[PDB]
Ligand binder design. Structure first.
Ligand SMILES: *C(=O)[C@H](C[C@@H]1CCCNC1=O)NC(=O)[C@H](CC(C)C)NC(=O)[C@@H](NC(=O)c1ccco1)C(C)C
Length: 301
């Protein structure tokens, strides 16, 4: 029993983290086979952040200008190119610790683990969700850029996020490993605006199922609802609409608990309309939306 915000084991990603220094800027790089991937703003300075010309900045850099270190060992850069907002540094040594991996672009509402790194060395691992407005609520300081987000399926690491920036909000934005930003953001210090965030309804429901599986059942009421009637209430509380696809995705949890999805929807409707009255669910006094249905099943095997 028990339910915790649980991250993937990070060992396969730890063996890929290197440090990239160009001038006075140092961030993290991802070393896979003979390529190091890192955010392109490693080539910027203070002169170069309102509106950097990255192609201009890059042409003035040699291979030798890129100092790449894997732990105590310098990796010689033999080629460099830019792909969207990431740099690809070809090095002369393939990483012997390269795991089986893929590059994936994740969807809003999906979750992943972040390995927070500074100077190429891991500091901590935590689980994050891609918010509907394409931000993440992470924990990143100066020098954390190039830290990656990932999921593991069996022996395969799916890299899906590389960290680039913090919005003045306190939320974070980055790219996939092809260097394309999630959301309408750009890697420059300009007035950009994150859209309004919403609550990921299918995730809240999955977490209510996790509560039931763990014996926290006080919120189950005797009612049912239609999907249309539920969504009218969800809309009022800034919850995402629940689709039939989401309903099907909750099938395994519904079967395990014997609670129909639309019956759980009726219980969530009452929690939204009435509050929790000082009670908790799985030790939380708020409804949690950063557990996907897959996350719940995986944890509650
Ligand atoms: C990379 O290591 C840093 C990590 C940031 C900065 C430190 C605090 N947390 C964090 O995640 N990334 C940067 O410094 C970027 C550099 C790019 C060339 C933009 N700059 C920012 O993240 C900057 N954000 C903005 O200027 C901005 C305006 C609108 C939206 O974002 C921060 C420092 C305010």
């Amino acid at each position: 029993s028990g339910f915790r915000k649980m991250a993937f084991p990070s060992g396969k990603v730890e063996g890929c983290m290197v440090q990239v220094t160009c001038g006075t800027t140092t961030l993290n790089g991802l070393w896979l086979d003979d390529v190091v991937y890192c955010p392109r703003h490693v080539i910027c300075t203070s002169e170069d952040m309102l509106n950097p010309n990255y192609e201009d900045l890059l042409i003035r850099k040699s291979n030798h200008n890129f100092l790449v270190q894997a732990g105590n060992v310098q990796l010689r850069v033999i080629g460099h190119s830019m792909q969207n907002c990431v740099l690809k540094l070809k090095v002369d040594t393939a990483n012997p610790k390269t795991p089986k991996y893929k590059f994936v672009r994740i969807q809003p509402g999906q979750t992943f683990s972040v390995l927070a790194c500074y100077n190429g060395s891991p500091s901590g691992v935590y689980q994050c969700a891609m918010r509907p407005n394409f931000t993440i609520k992470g924990s990143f300081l100066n020098g954390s850029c190039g830290s990656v987000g990932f999921n593991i399926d069996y022996d395969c690491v799916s890299f899906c996020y590389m960290h680039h920036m913090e919005l003045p909000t306190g939320v974070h934005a980055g790219t996939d490993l092809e260097g394309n930003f999630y959301g309408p953001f750009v890697d420059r210090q300009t007035a950009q605006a994150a859209g309004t965030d919403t609550t990921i309804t299918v995730n809240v429901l999955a977490w209510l199922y996790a509560a039931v599986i763990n014996g926290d059942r006080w919120f189950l009421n005797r009612f049912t609802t239609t999907l249309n009637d539920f969504n009218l209430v969800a809309m009022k509380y800034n919850y995402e609409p629940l689709t039939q696809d989401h309903v099907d995705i909750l099938g395994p949890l519904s079967a395990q608990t014997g609670i129909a999805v639309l019956d759980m929807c009726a219980s969530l409707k009452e929690l939204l309309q009435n509050g929790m009255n000082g009670r908790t669910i799985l030790g939380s006094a708020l409804l949690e939306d950063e557990f996907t249905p897959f996350d719940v099943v995986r944890q509650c095997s």
